[PDB]
């Protein structure tokens, strides 16, 4: 391990990115549950998958910078923080409850962010 100092800019919250090839359902920009088709239009087929980013998963409370606990670098004298997933929209070939197919804006995890709650004096 190399000292946090010998490396560069640190994240207040640790994240993990990776491809998601098995998301079968999502929530669109209207709050409705939708089915995510396995294949998207052509540019032959082409499997539809996504690039998602979540907070580093972590059961033994305590350590700073872990999803579900405090964030790294926050002033505990005045704030209570928590690392949370942040979602955004990406357009996806989907099917609604009526089965109608079409591109729709669905939410996915694209980042892990820090949130605050004052406690100051």
């Amino acid at each position: 391990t190399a000292p946090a100092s010998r490396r560069g800019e640190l994240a207040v919250c640790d994240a993990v990115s990776g491809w998601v090839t098995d998301r079968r359902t999502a929530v669109d920009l209207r709050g409705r549950e939708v089915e995510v088709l396995g294949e998207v239009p052509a540019a032959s087929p082409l499997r539809q998958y996504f690039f998602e980013t979540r907070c580093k998963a972590d059961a033994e409370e305590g350590g700073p910078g872990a999803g579900g606990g405090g964030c790294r670098g926050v002033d505990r004298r005045h704030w209570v923080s928590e690392c949370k997933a942040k979602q955004s929209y990406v357009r996806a070939l989907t099917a609604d409850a009526q089965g109608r197919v079409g591109w729709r804006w669905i939410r996915i995890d694209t980042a892990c962010v820090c949130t605050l709650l004052s406690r100051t004096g």
Binding site: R7, G8, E9
Partner: protein
Amino acid sequence: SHMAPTITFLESPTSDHHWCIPFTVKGNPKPALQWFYNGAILNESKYICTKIHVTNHTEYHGCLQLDNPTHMNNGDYTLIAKNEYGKDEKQISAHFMGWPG
């Protein structure tokens, strides 16, 4: 006094804001750094580059800085410390994320 550069540290990459392949090179004068990626010279850019964060005397601590890497960047990386008195080569394997599936 003087001596050829020696790579005293090269480890698997860890993820902070950007990913970092941590290295430590000892040598005087200051070693020229180059990386080899899967049998070829790695051309650095604004997404992949070398950063020396700590320079004591002849001890340099830095990272091969990576911005949003993916399976596309997995592979064997090789740091080359080339200097007036000779050279050194140390290698390390890197996995950032698996291929889709």
